[PDB]
């Protein structure tokens, strides 16, 4: 895979090659792949390769990354949650 | 979930509550659940709850557990691989 | 499971028993299994057991391994990417 606008990767704290779960709100598909850095500020969310069978252009998706962390850190950790407009630009 | 004969759990180095992947050779189903200790030497392989939709009595299954281990240990680790007869008893 | 040519395993930095994700370009199947060392230089990509229901001979596949690593290493880590010809030989 999934090409993500570098702005959304920074906003979401995702690295190139970090494991990502994609869930499709339109068809209910769920898959695991990895993040590729996309052209900054382009609003690109690009499905590459085998995933294109399951996730289609115009589908609304949720992109999720998880981390393993000790009990103490888990209770205090604040996850980076990025809401976006119809053009994939971050919102308040 | 999956109830496993305590002999197969010892043979495979599985603990009660350890995460297990079941793959179904008959229908190609793949799911993740956890091991429950079954009556020792009974040859029980019991599918409990939601999994019964996917994995059926008489199906041939492979039960798999994975571990996270440092590079050094990964190269030397010997996985415990248990072959069984039609009655779920260990074989040589 | 998946039997991989020892050359591709070395090229991709995969050990026997390392967890592998197979994604099928032909039918969109996605599954998790582990690597078995195949005859070196044979170009073998063999699907063994239950996985054979989902991933078929002749299919184009991507084989993926993931690693757990501390924040610091994750930001610098360079993954091993292996391109292959139609005969499963590295480039």
């Amino acid at each position: 895979x999934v090409t993500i606008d570098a702005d959304l990767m920074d906003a979401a704290d995702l690295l190139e090659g970090e494991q990502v779960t994609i869930v499709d709100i339109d068809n209910g598909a769920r898959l695991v792949t990895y993040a590729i850095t996309g052209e900054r500020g382009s609003g690109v969310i690009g499905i590459n390769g085998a995933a294109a069978h399951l996730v289609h252009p115009g589908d609304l998706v949720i992109l999720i990354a998880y981390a393993t962390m000790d009990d103490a850190r888990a209770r205090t950790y604040q996850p980076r949650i990025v809401f976006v407009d119809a053009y994939n630009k971050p919102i308040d | 979930x999956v109830t496993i004969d305590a002999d197969l759990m010892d043979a495979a180095d599985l603990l009660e509550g350890e995460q297990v992947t079941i793959v179904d050779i008959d229908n190609g189903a793949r799911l993740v659940t956890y091991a429950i200790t079954g009556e020792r030497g009974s040859g029980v392989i019991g599918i409990n709850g939601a999994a019964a939709h996917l994995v059926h009595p008489g199906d041939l299954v492979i039960l798999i557990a994975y571990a996270t281990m440092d590079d050094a240990r990964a190269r030397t680790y010997q996985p415990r691989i248990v072959f069984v007869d039609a009655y779920n008893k260990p074989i040589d | 499971x998946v039997t991989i040519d020892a050359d591709l395993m070395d090229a991709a930095d995969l050990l026997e028993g390392e967890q592998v994700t197979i994604v099928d370009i032909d039918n969109g199947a996605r599954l998790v299994t582990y690597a078995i060392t195949g005859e070196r230089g044979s170009g073998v990509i063999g699907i063994n057991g239950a996985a054979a229901h989902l991933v078929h001979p002749g299919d184009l596949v991507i084989l993926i391994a993931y690693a757990t690593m501390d924040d610091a290493r994750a930001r610098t880590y360079q993954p091993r990417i292996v391109f292959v010809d139609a005969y499963n030989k590295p480039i």
């Binding site: 981390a67 | - | 995969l14 170009g43 063994n48």
Partner: peptide, 24 residues
């Protein structure tokens, strides 16, 4: 805090064989 990262990829390999009833 551990991230899961891509480490290995064999891109567009061709499946050569399959055995439903493999023992190993």
């Amino acid at each position: 805090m551990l991230r899961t990262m891509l480490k290995s990829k064999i891109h567009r390999a061709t499946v050569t064989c399959a055995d439903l009833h493999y023992v190993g």
